[PDB]
Amino acid sequence: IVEGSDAEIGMSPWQVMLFRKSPQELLCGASLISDRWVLTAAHCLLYPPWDKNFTENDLLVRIGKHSRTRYERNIEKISMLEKIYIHPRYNWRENLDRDIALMKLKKPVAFSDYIHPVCLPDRETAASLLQAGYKGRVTGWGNLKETWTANVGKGQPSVLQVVNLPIVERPVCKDSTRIRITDNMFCAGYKPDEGKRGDACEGDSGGPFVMKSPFNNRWYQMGIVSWGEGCDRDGKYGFYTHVFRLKKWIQKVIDQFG
Amino acid sequence: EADCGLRPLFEKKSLEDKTERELLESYIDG
Ligand SMILES: NC(=O)CSCCCNC(=O)[C@H](CCNC(=O)c1ccc(Cl)s1)NC(=O)Cc1cccc(Cl)c1
Ligand SMILES: *[C@@H]1O[C@H](CO)[C@@H](O)[C@H](O)[C@H]1NC(C)=O
Numbered sequence: 001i002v003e004g005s006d007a008e009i010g011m012s013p014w015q016v017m018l019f020r021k022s023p024q025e026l027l028c029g030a031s032l033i034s035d036r037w038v039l040t041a042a043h044c045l046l047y048p049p050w051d052k053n054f055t056e057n058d059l060l061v062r063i064g065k066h067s068r069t070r071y072e073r074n075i076e077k078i079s080m081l082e083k084i085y086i087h088p089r090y091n092w093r094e095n096l097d098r099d100i101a102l103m104k105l106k107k108p109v110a111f112s113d114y115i116h117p118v119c120l121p122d123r124e125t126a127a128s129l130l131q132a133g134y135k136g137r138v139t140g141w142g143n144l145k146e147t148w149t150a151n152v153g154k155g156q157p158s159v160l161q162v163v164n165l166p167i168v169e170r171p172v173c174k175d176s177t178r179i180r181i182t183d184n185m186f187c188a189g190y191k192p193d194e195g196k197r198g199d200a201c202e203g204d205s206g207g208p209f210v211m212k213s214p215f216n217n218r219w220y221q222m223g224i225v226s227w228g229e230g231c232d233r234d235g236k237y238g239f240y241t242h243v244f245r246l247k248k249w250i251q252k253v254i255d256q257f258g
Numbered sequence: 259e260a261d262c263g264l265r266p267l268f269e270k271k272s273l274e275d276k277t278e279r280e281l282l283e284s285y286i287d288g
């Protein structure tokens with residue numbers, strides 16, 4: 001997370017870490033939507049152009065973590081994957097359309113003060129909240145900046161990072177890039193005139209874009225960290241999987257297999 | 259499950275993380 005701050009403990013009890021088995025390394029972020037269901041981006045598991053094809057036993061999910069490195073014994077839970085469900089029309093070849101993936105845990109995880117699921121938006125919440133200029137919140141242990149000298153130069157957070165970024169007009173989003181953006185994506189960040197900065201970076205993908213509803217004071221996941229040409233560049237934006245658009249699919253997957 | 263989106267350590271404890279006010283102010287103005 002670029003231009004971020006450390007999260008408070010429990011600030012994002014639904015954040016999930018995707019951990020690679022060998023090499024023992026961080027892959028991506030994700031979110032907890034149920035005691036046995038985890039939501040993430042499809043390019044975290046499958047992206048052939050960079051030779052990426054991760055399968056169920058290739059990784060594990062660490063839920064309830066605060067620190068990026070420390071093994072948070074007795075606070076975090078480590079769960080293994082029963083199955084991975086990647087969207088059938090996920091278009092990695094073109095624009096990353098439908099960049100979404102569900103993951104069924106083998107055994108249900110037990111909620112704590114540090115592990116709690118997020119809500120998924122209904123018809124109305126999507127309409128009321130996903131408007132240009134409203135701000136949501138993005139969290140992850142991703143890099144603090146695009147590039148940083150190998151000496152010192154920070155670069156990697158010690159703990160989870162959090163920013164609030166404003167939803168940006170679809171017409172502005174389409175003019176920001178030459179990638180064909182779709183109904184399944186929405187973009188967020190500050191415009192260069194706005195005199196403020198922030199964005200996701202490498203490692204934050206798959207994590208959740210959330211907004212707290214002003215009506216029920218609940219936290220809704222409106223976006224999955226999807227893609228961005230760089231990190232916090234001026235006149236560039238981060239693009240997010242528009243969760244409500246693909247929610248009918250999320251329902252089909254869980255009503256069958258869950 | 260029905261308790262989704264209500265964090266054990268803030269909402270349930272009537273507590274506010276250091277930044278959720280920016281989110282609320284964006285709904286009205288500044
Ligand atoms: N839709 C297309 O096809 C265009 S591809 C995107 C252009 C190449 N990617 C990148 O420059 C960045 C580098 C680090 N920045 C970030 O992580 C993010 C910034 C803001 C948000 Cl929001 S994420 N990575 C990614 O965006 C993630 C990614 C994208 C594709 C494949 C994979 Cl494997 C991973
Ligand atoms: C990914 O690997 C599995 C092997 O477990 C294989 O069956 C599948 O076809 C691979 N997919 C791609 C896109 O390479």
Ligand code: NA
Nearest residue numbers: 189233236237
């Ligand atoms: Na930007």
